[PDB]
Structures are given as structure tokens and as C-alpha cells.
Subunit: 387 residues, 4 copies
Amino acid sequence: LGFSFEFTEQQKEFQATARKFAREEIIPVAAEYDKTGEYPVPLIRRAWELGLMNTHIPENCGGLGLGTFDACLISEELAYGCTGVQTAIEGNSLGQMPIIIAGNDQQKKKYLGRMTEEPLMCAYCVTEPGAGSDVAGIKTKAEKKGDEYIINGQKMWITNGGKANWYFLLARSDPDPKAPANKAFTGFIVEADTPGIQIGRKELNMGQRCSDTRGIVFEDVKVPKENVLIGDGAGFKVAMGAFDKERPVVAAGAVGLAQRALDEATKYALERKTFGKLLVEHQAISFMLAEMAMKVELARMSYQRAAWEVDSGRRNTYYASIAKAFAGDIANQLATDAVQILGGNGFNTEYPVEKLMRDAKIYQIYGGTSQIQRLIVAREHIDKYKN
Amino acid sequence: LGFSFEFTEQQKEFQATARKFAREEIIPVAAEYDKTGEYPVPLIRRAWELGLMNTHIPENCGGLGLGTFDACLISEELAYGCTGVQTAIEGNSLGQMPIIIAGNDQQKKKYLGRMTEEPLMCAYCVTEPGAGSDVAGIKTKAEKKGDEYIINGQKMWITNGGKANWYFLLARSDPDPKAPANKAFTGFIVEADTPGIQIGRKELNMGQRCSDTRGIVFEDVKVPKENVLIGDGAGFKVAMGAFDKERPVVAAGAVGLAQRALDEATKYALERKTFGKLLVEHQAISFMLAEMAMKVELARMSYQRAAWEVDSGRRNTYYASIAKAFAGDIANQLATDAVQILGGNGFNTEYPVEKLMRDAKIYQIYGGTSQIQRLIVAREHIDKYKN
Amino acid sequence: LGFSFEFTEQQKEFQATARKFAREEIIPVAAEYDKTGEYPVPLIRRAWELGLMNTHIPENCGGLGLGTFDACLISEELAYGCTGVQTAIEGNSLGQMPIIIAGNDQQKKKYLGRMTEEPLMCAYCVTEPGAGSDVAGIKTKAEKKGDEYIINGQKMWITNGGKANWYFLLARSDPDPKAPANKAFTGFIVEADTPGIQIGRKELNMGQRCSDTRGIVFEDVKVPKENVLIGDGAGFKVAMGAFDKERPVVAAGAVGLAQRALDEATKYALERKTFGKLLVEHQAISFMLAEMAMKVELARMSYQRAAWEVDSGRRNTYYASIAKAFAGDIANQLATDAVQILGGNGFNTEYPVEKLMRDAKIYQIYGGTSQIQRLIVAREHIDKYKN
Amino acid sequence: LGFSFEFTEQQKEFQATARKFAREEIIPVAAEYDKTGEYPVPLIRRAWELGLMNTHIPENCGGLGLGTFDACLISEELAYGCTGVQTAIEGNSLGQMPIIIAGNDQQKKKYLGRMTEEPLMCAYCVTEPGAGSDVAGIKTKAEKKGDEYIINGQKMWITNGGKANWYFLLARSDPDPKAPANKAFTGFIVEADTPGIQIGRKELNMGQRCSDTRGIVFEDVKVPKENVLIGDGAGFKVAMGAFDKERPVVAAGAVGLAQRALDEATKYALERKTFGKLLVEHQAISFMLAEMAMKVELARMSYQRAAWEVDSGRRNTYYASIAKAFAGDIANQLATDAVQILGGNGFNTEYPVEKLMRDAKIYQIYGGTSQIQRLIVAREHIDKYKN
Ligand SMILES: CCCCCCCC(=O)SCCNC(=O)CCNC(=O)[C@H](O)C(C)(C)COP(=O)(O)OP(=O)(O)OC[C@H]1O[C@@H](n2cnc3c(N)ncnc32)[C@H](O)[C@@H]1OP(=O)(O)O
Ligand SMILES: CCCCCCCC(=O)SCCNC(=O)CCNC(=O)[C@H](O)C(C)(C)COP(=O)(O)OP(=O)(O)OC[C@H]1O[C@@H](n2cnc3c(N)ncnc32)[C@H](O)[C@@H]1OP(=O)(O)O
Ligand SMILES: CCCCCCCC(=O)SCCNC(=O)CCNC(=O)[C@H](O)C(C)(C)COP(=O)(O)OP(=O)(O)OC[C@H]1O[C@@H](n2cnc3c(N)ncnc32)[C@H](O)[C@@H]1OP(=O)(O)O
Ligand SMILES: CCCCCCCC(=O)SCCNC(=O)CCNC(=O)[C@H](O)C(C)(C)COP(=O)(O)OP(=O)(O)OC[C@H]1O[C@@H](n2cnc3c(N)ncnc32)[C@H](O)[C@@H]1OP(=O)(O)O
Ligand SMILES: Cc1cc2nc3c(=O)[nH]c(=O)nc-3n(C[C@H](O)[C@H](O)[C@H](O)COP(=O)(O)OP(=O)(O)OC[C@H]3O[C@@H](n4cnc5c(N)ncnc54)[C@H](O)[C@@H]3O)c2cc1C
Ligand SMILES: Cc1cc2nc3c(=O)[nH]c(=O)nc-3n(C[C@H](O)[C@H](O)[C@H](O)COP(=O)(O)OP(=O)(O)OC[C@H]3O[C@@H](n4cnc5c(N)ncnc54)[C@H](O)[C@@H]3O)c2cc1C
Ligand SMILES: Cc1cc2nc3c(=O)[nH]c(=O)nc-3n(C[C@H](O)[C@H](O)[C@H](O)COP(=O)(O)OP(=O)(O)OC[C@H]3O[C@@H](n4cnc5c(N)ncnc54)[C@H](O)[C@@H]3O)c2cc1C
Ligand SMILES: Cc1cc2nc3c(=O)[nH]c(=O)nc-3n(C[C@H](O)[C@H](O)[C@H](O)COP(=O)(O)OP(=O)(O)OC[C@H]3O[C@@H](n4cnc5c(N)ncnc54)[C@H](O)[C@@H]3O)c2cc1C
């Protein structure tokens, strides 16, 4: 009772670990990995050791059993170093989410347990080239055959896609088009090393070059019915819950990038003199940093509220979509203003800012696009007044 | 311990009392009071007996001894009903702030305890015809003369100016112009019943038309030495403090005016159907309302932080400024969007929304413009990076 | 044959005329008319003799035969003085347009001509209680008694509809709701004197109070057969044609208000001083003015474009709505920005700005709200790629 | 004359040619040049022979002798295909603009003519490591050696510094710090290979990758007094005049990128289906497209006017800075939204929109950043007031 914006000593220490790891271990090689686009294997092994990686995996699976407010708290620190790296680590949590909320005891121990005693990666396969935002459209067929299922399809833009040990899979189990979204799909947990899973090439994208984003083909994949999460048909709902829980940490990724641009821009404004006055002395510039500070702040508090809402055990769809919407948006506003203050240098590859601009954009695309976030928020807002 | 976004039981009770009051007692009559420009004496008196008024006066002074966080939540409600009345009531606490934060026990029993016994009002006198944002530019002087300070000068735009029992007055006490702000000004406690004071006529502003705004000339007003707050020079430092601890409460009322606009708009949106579809079914409007909720949802969190901060004995300046800047601005975007989705009806005096737009305006002018707020945030921010 | 951003010697003349009247005879009284709300009859009587008022009526019908471009530059200057009066004098051109563009020679001389004889008013009756934007949602009836129509209905937000000799009416003729817009509506030139025409009371609005606005219940108003403009059920286009034709003027009307806002605020900026600096010194303010300039410039060039399109015979719809949208939008931004720069004064009635803020609000709703503008621009734009 | 937006047959001609060349030779390779960064010699040469490259060289000297308008008309076309190409093709005009204004006929014959007979290039050197926007801040020392001038210092970000036949240069001739900008600098022409010029490495930037951007060093270069443009003292005013004529052209190209982003997103919105309907059916995607068209049509007019003003003999400064600022601004807004409509796809390199976003950022930095562009508008604006 009574509002409180105070972290608990443990949370404070996690923050200390992540922050140091980002500043002294990530930022130097962030640009190296940006250019080469090479997978951050060294970094993820470290992140794993420092215990900043499968932070949700329950304690009884050898995990830290940390909450969501904690994940966001960390992700914002890792993001300040490099979103391309943070996304990679975050992939595991997004993929582990379905098994964490909805898996049974035997499933939790078999798949979350491995991730704890071995730095393995996993991916969350839902998006199809045919449709990403409208989840209820996916065509990946899952034909029930005996005591197993035959998956059939193709996925697109999957994080850690070609580096996962196993995947979360959402497929259409009910062959009837008329079937309602709430009982038409099924969520499975399919091991990567399965005959029939053709993994596609790495896509070259504009902003998180070191992440493993790939398309993936499932032609006649067999999946044991034991590897069916809740039941046949409760896939959609399981997927929904996963997003609801994970969107705050994604917002936290935005504020991370936002912070970095706020820091970069300021340090420079404080060093560069232009019409004899320092850059920071020109009201225009000072006002920019003011608003850049105003935005990153509000974004910090939005994800916090969202995570706290979930951990308090309240459906957070409303506050999560608000958080993602705003943070991903402003993360893109701050990034550009940074390269703007840095002038001609900001457009150049040697300065950090340019990369921050390229990275920013996906925060308005993956994890639900900004338009979908609005759509959800209006869906939640009106339902309060409706009747 | 950790983060919390939960009000206490006492806060919930207060919030309720406040809400039911604005909802049922203010909202109705506010329409008439706005048109007649008549002071809302009745609504004020009921507020005073309900205890929604001098919620800062110390418990050992007949007061409640509530914090800035408490005043805030109450104010968002009163405002929701009507900002003209809220501002009329909030002015009281602003005037009493310098005494609360810097008056000795005797000045407190006297001027504070007095407001416990009868629904008296008071005002904060600082702004002048040619000096508002630039505090250290006031010219109203107060030269010592034995055991009195004889004060000459006029003040402008003083809220509750013509309906107050006593005043907080900030005047220059150092002749030498070069004398620094942190020792040149002195805050005196003037009784309205004092001879020398010339009270101007009620100014007609477009906004919170039932609130009492007017100018006050001070010809040869003597002030018994004992009414100085800390002493000569303490003025700037004491006014500055009040401003800080009090800004979050005004931003509260901006979010209040915002929440109202949002409500009215969503209710009307679920009413008017245009191309066979209700307004809530047209995506332009849908995204509009979602965005609308967002700006409110965030502004509320900004003042809450600013309030929590100061209550915890922390320097709130930075946040008090961020809150006020963001709250005031968004209220203006929500006012006009509310008028916008009510279309033609919104422009008509029979509909509440047009009033909301006229009112929202002062929120970027008084209590520190959006402009000076940007300046403060910038100053507060850059200092973090100066070495 | 090559671009030309220059007026004809002929046009420059009108500009200077309407400029004088606005900034000489209109401006001073506009202030009082707003506080009192009474119809600016004198000013209309003055504009009429001075020319500038029924500048569309064909030469052969008594009028100057001028055209929308001229109409724009003339009204832009007028609106500078008071949109209230502008909307009053424009109510005529709106009402005349459909009688012009689609009226048989007989009705042309019959109706438009008397306007040449005396300063008479006319209204444009489209909107009604349940619908405005949804034009095809008109429920106003009109039955044919062979050689005489019988109109039953009720219009609502009619400008100049309380001082009109006659009104253009658009009524649903085919009870069958499957009736395609293009064919389901008929346009009548009805006279106020006709029985059954029961005029509503004046509406109090937030802004152009000076202008007369009201509803009209058409009890059993019968209208002689020869009053149909084109032909029973071709009325839907005439209104749209009048629109397109006339939207540049309301835009220009907006631009006039935007200019008044910019003229007013800049003057203040070069007089007011805050930290021992004229307001203009502060880079934040100068950048603000530079943007208010940019907006007026583009809206000016945007309406000058639409006005030209239709004057070159080319259909303007696309460029017109682009203009109405943009101009309207920036009008408000400029009004609220001008207020801001005047500080307390801005929010005060002894000052011009406040009025301008309350006036600019209608420019986003009436004569095609900002939304439907974006709606038709997307329509026109898309079809250029559509097949 | 009289307002006209209709083209000349010849410009309609240039337009068609630039349209064919651009969309039929540039766009199908532009990407490959973005991946390799190879200076597009095949493109430059073909542009040289199509007669859409050194358009401003007068007839007598060999060139087409075209004005600023036709320049923009051709530049805005090429930009649609690729800004990187366009920029190199444009660097030439920038490098020779001063001479055209400012050069005695002897200089013209020898320096613009040497161009008109072979596909040669030329650079415009002004930006330095420590000065870019503050042009009066350049510290390169040009000393008067009795019969010639010696050059000492270094320039930076010189568009096409490694590929220029000759360079225009702006150096500080008056050592006396007190020396006002109006008489401090002088402009020279320098054959690329005068001894002492150490051209640096090609800079790697985020967006006009193929455009040959570098920094040069002028350790001890001899330059004959007959290569001085006007004469000792006149430099700043010459560099300015060049900028003033070129800025509309920089504005035009930004619009080109915008139109390329608009056409690209409009085509995908008409082929991507999401909730059982193509993106165009969603009001959010439809309204986005309208707002993108609006910024384009306007941005187009802003330069079309600014180019006219200058071609009409009257200073275009105020209009150039407006066109440039608004153009560079909306060019960036469209690029991003262009990405947004494509969703995940847009963020991938197999698509155009992504490269468009990387190219747009520079349009708010080179040729006069967005904020200095504002400064100028405010300068000229308040000027026509305070007199
Ligand atoms: C963190 C790691 C680093 C980052 C890794 C990369 C992350 C990624 O990109 S993954 C992103 C993948 N794709 C997306 O996120 C796109 C987002 N898509 C959506 O949000 C949905 O498609 C959305 C909201 C449009 C819904 O589709 P739609 O079919 O219209 O919804 P609806 O009919 O309401 O849903 C179906 C049923 O589930 C329920 N449901 C929907 N949303 C929710 C919710 N939030 N909570 C609970 N139940 C829900 C519905 O209420 C309904 O149940 P019923 O009607 O029986 O009560
Ligand atoms: C709706 C609620 C009911 C009431 C409705 C009506 C409310 C109102 O409208 S009354 C408000 C009228 N006026 C304002 O709000 C004033 C806005 N102006 C300001 O905040 C200030 O003038 C400001 C900070 C922007 C500019 O300060 P400036 O004039 O440069 O003085 P500055 O140089 O900061 O003075 C510095 C000194 O004061 C003190 N000081 C300065 N800022 C602060 C601060 N934020 N916190 C504490 N002390 C401070 C220190 O001693 C400091 O340093 P030093 O000792 O070195 O002098
Ligand atoms: C300052 C003082 C002066 C101002 C005073 C105030 C004056 C006003 O307020 S003016 C009235 C304001 N109201 C409006 O502007 C209402 C706007 N709404 C509309 O225009 C319509 O509802 C609209 C066009 C958006 C959508 O119309 P909808 O009902 O969907 O019909 P739509 O499909 O567009 O058109 C149907 C047919 O009519 C034709 N039509 C409609 N609009 C047009 C047009 N602009 N040009 C040509 N033909 C048109 C269509 O081509 C189609 O023709 P066909 O049948 O041959 O194919
Ligand atoms: C086309 C190919 C693609 C693009 C390739 C890349 C192109 C580039 O980036 S080139 C580099 C671009 N750099 C710029 O745009 C920066 C421009 N800004 C400036 O130079 C300054 O900041 C400026 C002019 C705005 C203001 O300050 P400052 O530098 O002190 O000069 P200022 O005081 O305004 O004026 C000095 C003198 O010049 C005169 N002057 C100013 N503007 C002009 C003008 N537009 N025309 C002529 N004379 C002028 C002034 O009147 C004054 O003269 P006087 O002796 O009568 O006082
Ligand atoms: C690098 C990268 C990594 C990703 N990683 C993952 C991952 O780990 N797992 C995963 O499952 N997915 C992942 N994705 C895919 C991502 O989830 C989708 O991009 C996103 O949900 C959008 O779907 P889409 O790409 O199909 O866009 P589209 O669905 O084509 O949408 C296109 C545009 O239309 C708008 N829009 C769509 N529907 C509507 C509507 N009805 N109303 C209004 N506007 C609408 C969208 O907002 C957008 O502006 C990733 C994508 C990228 C690029
Ligand atoms: C691809 C490319 C090509 C170029 N080609 C050329 C070329 O051919 N020739 C040439 O001469 N130059 C060229 N330049 C350089 C260009 O002119 C500069 O980078 C640009 O003017 C920004 O200058 P800067 O980097 O020195 O900005 P800085 O002066 O370092 O500081 C700039 C930042 O602070 C802002 N700022 C500065 N002063 C103020 C103020 N008083 N008020 C408000 N905001 C202010 C700027 O707007 C921006 O936000 C090019 C640059 C690039 C990247
Ligand atoms: C209805 C109402 C009620 C009020 N109630 C009270 C009350 O109870 N007590 C009291 O003492 N006062 C009160 N005031 C006055 C109010 O506090 C001031 O109006 C406010 O502080 C702004 O000051 P100003 O009007 O002098 O604007 P100015 O200081 O004149 O400034 C004018 C413009 O310049 C901008 N500006 C100034 N300096 C800068 C800069 N450095 N950079 C950028 N922009 C700048 C300002 O924001 C504004 O836009 C009230 C005013 C009103 C209208
Ligand atoms: C002073 C005044 C004078 C006027 N004079 C005239 C006159 O002479 N003649 C005349 O015919 N009318 C006149 N009007 C009315 C004016 O034309 C209407 O207000 C306008 O058409 C908007 O219609 P509405 O108010 O009925 O809004 P509605 O049709 O109720 O629309 C309400 C809200 O929803 C939005 N909306 C509606 N449909 C959609 C959609 N499909 N997609 C997205 N958003 C949508 C609208 O933008 C608005 O925000 C006047 C109004 C005023 C206040």
C-alpha cells in the first residue's frame, strides 16, 4: 500500500551486474558485431554466467525464478549496450514464456531444466510470411496422427531461429476455417533437431544485425502429443499470455536504446561549441535534450507499471500495450534526434548514434506493431465504458 | 520495499469522497458558474467541510497533515468536475505552502490554524504586470522602516486575489540591482485587512471563468517585521520551494481535465453512428481514443512520481517539472480531440467539451509555462553530465 | 506555360481593398461583436457596397463574375479581421454556388440577381440533427406532387440560416434506402417566406458567435416544381460540386486567422522582455515563430493551388481537401501558439489572441472535418494506383 | 502575369527524360550501388550525355543555361530513383554555382567549359572538422603571397572531394579576428591536383553510401590571384549566394525520396492483406497514406516557389530555407512510414523502403540542418516586422 518507486536491494544488485556488463563488456564489441553481423556467442555465454539470461525459469528447474519487473529492469541495461545482443538473450525468455505459464511439471523440467544447466537458445515461432500482426491467420497445419502430430508449414522472422535447441510452435489444428480463434490453434514445443525442419538463411536487416533472424520450414514434422502445451486448441490463448508477459521487457529494450541516445547526444552537446556558445547553450538544443529526457523518463515508468501490473497478478494487456506503443515510438524519436545533434558526425559510421537509429525501428514492428498496440488499447479502453 | 502502484486504504477513502463530490456536487453546477463567472462559494464551503481543502495544514494545527501525494489524488477528482473550482481551492494550498515549508510555530498557529476554523481563502502573490516566468525580475519592493517593512508595488493575475483573508507576498528587499536572487528577495505574510492595499477588478479570462483572478496594487503597506518568513533574502529560496512542492498538484488537475475530456468523448463515441457504424467502429476514431487514454495514463504517472519524490524528502524539481510540462500539454491535446469527436455538437455551449478546451489552456501558462518547464528539465538533466 | 506565383494588377487591387476594410472598419468592432454576438449587419452592408461579397454571380446575372481564386484572396484578407464576419459573408457564396453551377438561366437571374439588388442572405441546408459528415444519411424528405415538391424535415447547424431570403436544400427523394447517393438526393432552391418553414433559435458557440447559426424545421414546406436545380435525384452531386468549389475559401478563411495569429504574436515578441531579452531573443521563441511562418506559407500555397485547379476547369477535389485539411490543422496550432507567446495576456479577453483561438476550432469540423478530408485525399490518391 | 502551376513544354520534356532515365536505369541498380558503394560512374556519364547534369552552365560557355526551376524539376526526378546518384550529379552544380554568379568571364570559360566537353566533376569545399553550420567559423588560412595566394588548412565531408577536377574553396584571408564575415573570407577555384592537396579516404555513412564523400587537407597550396572569384574580402557573401540558389534543389530531391517512399508503400498497401482485407481498407493505413501525400504535394510547392522567386530575380532566401526545412522534415516522416506499412518486410534489405530511411536522415543535416534552416526563417520573418 502506498506508491513506491524504490527498488529492493536484490533488484538493485541485478541492475548493477547488467549495467557493468553492458558498459565494460558489450559496448566495445557492439559495433564490431554490427558490421560483421556475427552472432554474439561470447557475450551470451557471459550473460548466461552472470545469470542475466533465463531469468524467468522457475527455481525448481535450477532457475533464478525472477519476476517480470526484474527482467525489464535488466533488459533496459543490456539494451543500453546493444539491442541486437539483448534481443538474442530475450529470445530465450519469449520462447520460454509459453512453457513457463502453461507447461506441466514434466515439461518444465525437461525443457527449462536444460536451459539452466547449458547455455542453450530457443525461439518463439508464430509469425508466418502470410501474416504476423493478425496471429489468427497462420496456416501452419498440425495434423493429429495417433500419438503425435504432423506439423506442416513455414515460419518467418524468427528470433534465434537458426540457433535454437527447441522451438515453441503455434499451428492450426482445426481444419475448419469457420473455427473460432479461441479453439482453432494449438501450441507445441518442438525440438530443433527434428527430421523435417529446414532452417533458412540469415536475413540482412537494417537494425539488429547481430541477432539471428531467419525463416524456418517445417515440412512433415512429427511432434509427440506429450509436447502439446495445454490441450488441443488452447494455443492462441497460450500465445496471447506470452506476449502480455513479455511486452514490458520489449518496451524496456526501447528505453535502453533511448537512454543510450540521450547519453550520446548530451555528452556531445556538452563538448561541441558552434556559434561561440556551446551546443547545449543554444535554447533549441537544450529544449531538444529536455524533451529527449522527458520521453525516455515516461517510457521508463510505463514499462515498470506494466510489469508490476503483471507480477501483482493482474491482467496487464492494457498497460503493456500502452508501454510498448509509447516506448517503441519514443525510442525512435530519441534515436534520430541524437544523430541530429551530432550533425555530420552523427550520420557517419564511426559514431555510435547512426547504429542507434537503425536499431530503433524494429521496436515499432516486432512484438506487435505500434498500430496493433493502439488497436488493443482502444479495445481495452472502450470495454470499460461499453454497457 | 519494491515498486507499488497501490493506493493505501486512507487514500482510497479520500479519493472516493473527492470523486463522489465532483461527480455529483460539482459537475452539475459548474456549467452555470462558468457562464456567470460567479465565485463558487458554495462548492468551496462544502469542499472545506468535507476536508478536501487545506489538506497540508499540520495535524497539530487543526489540519489533516496530508502529503503532496494525497493532495494530488484529491485534486485530480475536483478538477475532473471543474478546474475553475479546483484552481479556486488549490490556490489556498499554494498560498499556505511557504508557511508550511518555512514558517515558524507562531506564524503557523496564527495564519494556518485560522483556516481550520472558518472557510477562509488566501493567495500567492508573486507575478507582476511585467514579470512572470522571470521571478527575479519583480519590482515590488519592501524597504525596512524600524520594525516594519513598507511595501510599494503591484501584483498581477493573483488567484483568489480579491477573496482572500491573508496573502503570501514576494517582494524585492535589496536595493542594489546586482544583488543575487538568493538574497535579494523577501517573502512577507500580508493580511488582506491591511490598509494600503488597492484591489483591482475581476479579470475576464476565457478559461477557468468562475475562479477569481485579479490584480492587487500595494501603495504604502507596512508589514510588521514578524511576518517575514525566514528573513531578508530568504524570499527567492522560499518561493522556489513552494513552486516545486506545489507544481505536481497542478499537473494533477491537468490530468483531471484530461480524464474528463476522455470520458465525455468515449461516451459520445459509443453514441453517434455515422456511416451505418458507430464512431467507436471507425479506426480513425478508435486510434484517436486509444492515444487519448495513453496521454492521460502517462501524465497521471508523472505527477504521482513527482509527488512520491517530494513526500520521501527528495528533491522533486526535475520530475515536478517533467510532470507539469507533460500533463499541461497533453490536456490541451485531449481537450481539442474531445471537441473534435463531438464534431458540430462539441463547438456548442450546450456541450461540456468546448469548456474543456478553453480551460486546458492556462495549464501551459501558469505555475510555470511549458516553456520554462523545458528550461528547468534541461538544467536538471545536463548537471548530471557536467564534470 | 511555366509557373507564375504573381497576382494580376486586377487582383492586387481587390487584395488592398479587402485588406483596408478588414484592418479599418472590421477589426475594432469585431472585438465587441464577439462579446455581444449580434449579427454584423452593418459590416455586411459595408462589404456589399464595397464589392467584395457576392463575387461569383455571373456578369450576365448582375454579379462581377469573379472566381474562387479571387474569392480566396479576398476572403483570406477578410478572415484576418474576423472569421465571424467572413463566415457571415461566405454563407452567401456557399448558398449561391449550387444555384450558379447547376441553375437554369431563369433561376440564375431570378435568385442570384436580387442579391445584386440588395444585401440579401442565403443559407446552405445540408446538415441535420442526425447527420452531417454522412451526407448520404440525409433523412429529409421531398415528395413530388407532379408540379410541386413537398419537403418535410429538419436541418440543424445552418450558418446564415436565420437571415436567409432562401436556402439551397438537399433532400432524400427515394424512400427506398437502397437508393444510390448519386441518384437518391434532390436539390431545391426554397424561399424562407414559404409556409411551414419554422426557423430555430440562435446557437451559442465557442467561436464565431457573431455569425448567425441555427436549425430549421421544414414543417410542410411546398416548393414549386421549377425549383429543382438539375433533376429529381441529381442533387447529391450539386452539393459536392458546391463544396469542392467552395473548400479553398474556408481554408483561405483559416489562413486569414493564421496570419492574424502570426501578426499578433510576433509584435508581442518584439516588445515583451523576460530575462533582460525581448521574447524574440530566446531561440525557443524565434524557432516557434519560424514554424508559424512555415505553416501559413504552405497553407497559403495549398489553397492557391486548389482555387486555381477549379478555375482552370480541372476538378480540384484532391488538392482542395488537401488544402482544407492542412490549413484547418495549422490554424489551431498557430492560434494556441500565439496565445502562448502572450503569456497571461494571451489567456486574457482584453487581448485579441483568445478570440482567434476559439474561432479556429470550427475550421476542423464544418465544411468537411479534418478527418473526412484525409478520407477523400486517400481516396483520390489511391485510385491513381488502383485498378 | 498571373498565378499558374502549368509547366512549359520544355520542362515537361526534361521531366519525361529524367523520369525515363531515372526509373529505367537508376532504380534497377541503385541497390547494388548501395551495397557496394561504388561511385556510379556509368550513371554520372549517362546523366552527363542526357543533358540533365550541368544544366546551369550558360549557352555561350557550352551548357544548356537552365534556371533553378528546371534544375529542381530534374533533380526531384532523379531523387525518386536514387538520392546517392542524384547527390553526386548535384555536387557538380554546387561546386560551380559560385562561378556562375561570381566568376569573371575568363574564369567561366576555363572552368565551366572544361566541364561541358567531358564528364568531369567538381566539389564545393566549405565544411571543416570544427565548422560546418557556423560558416564564419572556418579557420583555413589563405595568405596573400604578393602575386598569388597560398592555402593552409583542411576541409571535411566534401561531397565528391576524391573525384573533383577542381574545387571551389572558402578561406579566411583577414587574420585580424575583429574582421567581420563581410570581409574576412575569399573564394578560390583550385585545380584538384595543385601540389599540397592530400585528399583523404572515402567516408562511410549511413545513407548516400555511393556518393563520394571525403575530407581533404591543403598543407601548402599555391593558387593564382586570377582564380580568385570576386577579389580579396568577398567570400562569405559568395558561398551564401550559392547556397541560396542550391537549397531549393536540395529541397526538391528530398521530395523525390518522399515520393519514392510514398509510391512504394502505396503499392504494398494495395497488395498486403491482414484482417481479411488489404491494408488500404484499414483507416489507420489509409489515413497514413493521405498524410504522406499531403506532406509531399506541399513540400513540392515549397521548392517550386522558392526556385521561381530566385529565377524571378528577387531573393528567395526566406523561401529556400522554408522549402529546405519542410522538405527535409517530411522526407524523413515518409521514409519511416514507408517502412511501417511494409512491416517486418520494410526492415529487411530485400526491400526499397529500408534504404530510403537511411538516405533521408542526411536531408536534415546537409545543405543547412533543420534548426539552422529555422533560424533563417525567423531572421527574415521578424525582420519584415521590426522596421
Ligand atoms: C522478448 C524477446 C525479444 C523480442 C523477440 C521478437 C518478438 C516478436 O516479434 S514476436 C511478435 C509476433 N506477432 C505479434 O506480436 C502480432 C500481435 N498480434 C496480436 O496482438 C493479435 O493478433 C490481436 C490482438 C490482433 C488479436 O487477433 P484477433 O483474432 O483479432 O483477437 P481476438 O478475437 O480478441 O482473440 C481471440 C481469443 O483470444 C482472446 N484474447 C485476445 N487477446 C487476449 C489477451 N491479451 N489476453 C487474453 N485473451 C486474449 C480473445 O479475447 C478471444 O477469446 P474469446 O473471444 O473466446 O474470449
Ligand atoms: C492550479 C493551482 C493553484 C494556483 C494557480 C496559479 C499558479 C501560479 O500561476 S503562481 C506561479 C507564478 N510564477 C512561476 O511559476 C514562476 C516560474 N519561474 C521559475 O520557476 C523560475 O523563475 C526559473 C527557475 C524558471 C528561473 O530561475 P532564475 O530567475 O534564473 O533564478 P536562478 O538563477 O535559478 O536562482 C537560483 C537560486 O535560487 C535557488 N533555486 C533556483 N532554482 C531552484 C529550484 N528549482 N529549487 C530550489 N532552489 C532553487 C538556489 O538558491 C539557486 O542558486 P544560487 O544560490 O546560486 O542563486
Ligand atoms: C465559412 C462559411 C462557409 C462554410 C459553412 C459550412 C458549410 C458546410 O459545413 S458544408 C457541409 C459539410 N458536410 C460535408 O462536407 C460532408 C462530407 N461528406 C461527404 O462528402 C460524403 O459523405 C463522402 C464523399 C465523404 C462520402 O460519400 P458517400 O456517402 O460514401 O458517397 P461516394 O461513394 O463518395 O459518392 C457516390 C457518388 O456520388 C459521387 N460524388 C461524391 N462526392 C463527389 C465529388 N467530390 N465529386 C464528384 N462526384 C462526387 C461519386 O463519384 C459517386 O458517383 P457515381 O455514383 O457516378 O460513381
Ligand atoms: C547539392 C548537392 C547535395 C548537397 C551537398 C552538400 C552541401 C553542403 O552541406 S554545403 C555546407 C552547408 N552549410 C550551411 O548551410 C550553413 C549555413 N549557415 C550560415 O552560414 C550561418 O549560420 C548564417 C548565415 C545562417 C547566419 O550566421 P553567420 O554565419 O554569422 O552570418 P550572418 O551574420 O547571417 O551574415 C553575414 C553577412 O552575410 C550577409 N548574408 C547573409 N545571408 C545572405 C544571403 N542569403 N545572401 C547574401 N548575403 C547574405 C549578411 O547580410 C551579412 O552582410 P553585412 O555585411 O551586410 O552584414
Ligand atoms: C528482425 C525481426 C524479428 C522478429 N522476431 C520475431 C520472433 O521472434 N517471433 C515472431 O513470431 N515474430 C517475429 N517477428 C515478426 C513480427 O512479429 C511482425 O513483423 C509484426 O507482428 C508485424 O507483422 P508483419 O511483419 O506481417 O506486418 P503486417 O501484418 O504486414 O502489417 C503491415 C502494416 O499494416 C498495419 N496493420 C496490420 N493490420 C492492421 C489493422 N488491422 N489495422 C491497422 N493497421 C494494421 C501494421 O501495423 C503495419 O503498419 C520479427 C520481425 C523482425 C523484422
Ligand atoms: C553526405 C554528406 C555530405 C556533405 N557534403 C558537404 C559538401 O559538399 N560541402 C560542405 O561544405 N559540407 C558538406 N557536408 C557537411 C555538412 O554541411 C555538415 O555536417 C552540416 O552543416 C552539419 O554541420 P556540423 O556537422 O558541423 O554541425 P555542428 O555545427 O557540428 O552542430 C550541429 C548540430 O547542432 C545544431 N546547431 C548548431 N548550432 C545551432 C544553433 N545556433 N541553434 C540551433 N541548433 C544549432 C545543428 O543543427 C545540429 O543539430 C556534408 C555532410 C554529409 C554527412
Ligand atoms: C488565470 C491565471 C491565473 C494565475 N494565478 C496566479 C496566482 O495565483 N499567483 C501568481 O503570482 N500568479 C498567477 N498567474 C500568473 C502566472 O503565474 C504567469 O502568467 C505565468 O507564470 C507566466 O508568466 P507571464 O504571463 O509573465 O509570461 P511571460 O513571462 O511574459 O513570457 C511570455 C512568453 O515568453 C515565454 N518565455 C519567457 N522566457 C522564455 C525563455 N527564456 N525561453 C523561452 N520562452 C520564454 C513564456 O512561456 C511565454 O510564452 C496567473 C495567470 C493567469 C492567466
Ligand atoms: C458554426 C457552424 C456552422 C455550420 N454551417 C453549416 C452550413 O451552413 N451547412 C451545413 O450543411 N453544415 C453546416 N455545419 C455543420 C458541419 O458541416 C458539420 O459539423 C460537419 O459536417 C461534421 O458533421 P457532424 O458535426 O454531424 O459530425 P458527425 O457526422 O457526427 O461526426 C462526428 C465526429 O466523428 C468523426 N467522423 C464521422 N464519421 C467518420 C468516419 N467515417 N471516419 C472517421 N471519423 C469520422 C467526425 O470527424 C467528427 O470528429 C456547421 C457547423 C457549425 C458548428
